[PDB]
Amino acid sequence: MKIKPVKVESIENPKRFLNSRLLTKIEVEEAIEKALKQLYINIDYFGEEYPTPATFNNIYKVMDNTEWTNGFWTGCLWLAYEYNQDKKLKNIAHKNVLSFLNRINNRIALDHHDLGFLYTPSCTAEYRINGDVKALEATIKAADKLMERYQEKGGFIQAWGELGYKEHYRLIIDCLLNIQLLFFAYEQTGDEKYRQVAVNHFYASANNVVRDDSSAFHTFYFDPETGEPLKGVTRQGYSDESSWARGQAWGIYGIPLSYRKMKDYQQIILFKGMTNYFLNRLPEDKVSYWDLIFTDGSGQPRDTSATATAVCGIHEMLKYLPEVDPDKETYKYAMHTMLRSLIEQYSNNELIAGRPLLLHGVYSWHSGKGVDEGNIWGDYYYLEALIRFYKDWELYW
């Protein structure tokens, strides 16, 4: 399948990245250890329950297993467990896994496309780590649940809402992270249908939700009768003309993740477009404002979760990017600079119950949800970035 041309911006003023110091083992180690101190404090705070999607005055509230974000908590626990092999972490994380198994068995709060966010960092994670059969069971059942939203007309996984209904007949860019679940199900079962849906969804996204200038729509609508693409909508950003930071980051990470399983060089080019766009709109400290139209002096809040996610994406793509790519070294230095800023300026220093790992995210600006607050996916991707740098990490995704 052909991907439409996108503008690939040159990485403007690349010395801003290349002149930086690479992160050392001790620097990353100390960041991991500081994060783990907070995680241990929070295991007692949350018990068998979960952080809310975002913090409130930098303190999480406690909730049950009914959001799109619960898996990110379990993911933090598994990442920590990989770092220190503490049976206590496995104990609580595996209890989360059993809760996720209960959730899919009873089809509780799962009529949406976020099955991957929920089940990948929780259940698939455990399967990677120790091959737990209930973790596998939950993962496959979750994959089947996700498959239920696939639309043959347009070849995409429909976002939450009424299935097949024109006014809801759309994909959202974050679904790029959720099709990884389907690639896993394909690998485990040999059932081609999983892979076909993932691949079709990828191209439907690439050709439509990614714009000609390499920026990202949040949502893209299709015609339920013909399957034709209709229009993109820039949801969650400041204005119609703006550039929501996390949407860009979902592309930056979702593309290389899918590339692992598809190996289409068009995906590397699409990555270069989206990543250069993101890099060019970073402020002085290389940490994205919540909308990329804002830079230093705007007085707008950052969205650190977008930057954490982009770091993971760049790290992933660099595993595959040819050595002869003239920007490969720039990308390496870029991800180091970005992660350094997160560690040194945005990571949590106050070790008290309910604090996040990472401060200054924005969940949903217009809805006033988690505005300049920690959030659980930002915490997760920050710790994933740390673990990525520190070891040869086997992806949950």
Side-chain angles (χ1 to χ4, degrees):
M1 180 64 56
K2 289 161 175 175
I3 298 174
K4 68 182 178 179
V6 299
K7 179 163 57 185
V8 181
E9 298 180 354
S10 68
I11 301 168
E12 296 169 357
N13 183 31
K15 294 176 193 287
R16 72 195 293 239
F17 305 116
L18 290 167
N19 287 358
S20 296
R21 294 156 292 141
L22 298 173
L23 282 165
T24 68
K25 185 180 174 190
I26 191 63
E27 285 173 319
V28 174
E29 210 167 65
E30 287 182 351
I32 291 171
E33 283 166 355
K34 191 174 72 170
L36 261 56
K37 284 175 186 176
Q38 192 57 66
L39 288 185
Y40 276 102
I41 289 170
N42 288 353
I43 288 177
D44 297 323
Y45 182 70
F46 298 122
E48 284 188 32
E49 291 196 300
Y50 301 82
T52 47
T55 62
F56 297 84
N57 301 131
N58 287 327
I59 303 295
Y60 283 113
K61 285 171 190 174
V62 184
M63 76 165 295
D64 63 5
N65 200 356
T66 60
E67 261 288 9
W68 70 274
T69 48
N70 299 265
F72 295 117
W73 166 244
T74 314
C76 288
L77 303 181
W78 286 127
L79 288 173
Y81 177 70
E82 294 201 51
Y83 181 77
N84 72 192
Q85 302 81 39
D86 183 4
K87 219 269 273 282
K88 186 209 280 162
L89 294 170
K90 173 183 178 167
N91 284 345
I92 185 58
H94 181 69
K95 281 176 191 166
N96 286 2
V97 170
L98 292 179
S99 174
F100 284 106
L101 185 44
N102 178 262
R103 188 174 175 181
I104 184 67
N105 277 346
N106 289 295
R107 299 174 62 88
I108 299 163
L110 293 174
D111 304 303
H112 54 253
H113 65 283
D114 292 317
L115 275 295
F117 283 143
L118 283 169
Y119 285 80
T120 300
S122 61
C123 299
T124 314
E126 187 171 26
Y127 185 71
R128 301 289 197 211
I129 292 165
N130 61 220
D132 186 89
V133 296
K134 287 190 175 282
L136 179 59
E137 181 187 346
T139 298
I140 302 304
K141 287 172 174 185
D144 291 336
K145 186 69 182 76
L146 185 57
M147 291 287 279
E148 293 173 8
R149 303 196 73 79
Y150 179 68
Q151 298 293 171
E152 286 181 5
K153 298 195 169 292
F156 68 96
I157 299 163
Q158 194 189 147
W160 46 265
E162 183 70 21
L163 284 172
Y165 178 53
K166 185 181 197 298
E167 308 307 322
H168 294 185
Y169 201 73
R170 74 217 193 281
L171 62 77
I172 296 174
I173 192 167
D174 70 352
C175 200
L176 289 181
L177 273 284
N178 289 275
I179 65 172
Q180 306 316 130
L181 171 61
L182 302 181
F183 285 125
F184 175 84
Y186 165 70
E187 291 171 351
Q188 296 302 311
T189 64
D191 189 340
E192 291 261 41
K193 290 172 187 169
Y194 292 122
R195 185 176 195 278
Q196 289 166 341
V197 166
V199 170
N200 287 353
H201 180 92
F202 179 84
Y203 287 115
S205 299
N207 275 314
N208 301 293
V209 86
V210 182
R211 305 192 73 171
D212 290 7
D213 64 355
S214 283
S215 72
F217 285 121
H218 168 99
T219 293
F220 206 96
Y221 285 88
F222 292 80
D223 190 308
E225 305 310 313
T226 64
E228 281 293 288
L230 291 175
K231 55 192 68 68
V233 184
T234 59
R235 178 174 152 88
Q236 287 197 59
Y238 183 74
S239 68
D240 299 338
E241 291 70 44
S242 70
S243 195
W244 176 52
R246 190 162 64 253
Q248 197 66 202
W250 291 137
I252 294 162
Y253 196 12
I255 293 167
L257 285 174
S258 300
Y259 174 83
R260 298 177 299 156
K261 309 301 179 181
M262 294 171 64
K263 293 303 184 101
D264 176 2
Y265 187 78
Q266 295 182 296
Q267 296 171 300
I268 284 172
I269 296 310
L270 200 64
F271 167 91
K272 283 155 66 67
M274 299 200 73
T275 304
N276 294 2
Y277 182 96
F278 190 87
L279 294 177
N280 285 343
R281 288 158 185 77
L282 292 179
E284 205 283 327
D285 74 0
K286 316 303 189 295
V287 172
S288 59
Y289 278 78
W290 73 272
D291 194 302
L292 296 172
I293 61 158
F294 304 120
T295 189
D296 301 293
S298 63
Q300 292 281 342
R302 309 308 183 93
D303 180 22
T304 52
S305 74
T307 296
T309 304
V311 166
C312 295
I314 294 168
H315 182 92
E316 186 60 25
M317 189 84 274
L318 256 24
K319 296 173 182 179
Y320 305 101
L321 198 69
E323 282 293 297
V324 299
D325 187 299
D327 287 336
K328 187 174 187 174
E329 179 159 77
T330 305
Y331 291 133
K332 179 206 173 76
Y333 276 80
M335 69 172 185
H336 273 80
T337 315
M338 297 158 79
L339 188 52
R340 179 179 292 287
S341 285
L342 293 180
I343 291 163
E344 293 182 354
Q345 297 301 135
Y346 294 92
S347 63
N348 176 54
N349 287 314
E350 193 186 352
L351 298 177
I352 60 161
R355 292 279 290 189
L357 306 186
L358 185 70
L359 301 168
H360 312 292
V362 174
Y363 180 14
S364 189
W365 191 81
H366 280 114
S367 299
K369 294 179 182 168
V371 179
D372 195 24
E373 296 281 355
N375 56 236
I376 194 58
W377 59 95
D379 285 2
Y380 173 80
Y381 291 116
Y382 169 65
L383 187 55
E384 194 197 278
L386 291 176
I387 294 297
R388 276 173 171 277
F389 272 54
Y390 192 75
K391 66 181 285 184
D392 176 24
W393 179 61
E394 187 183 2
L395 271 59
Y396 305 154
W397 313 98

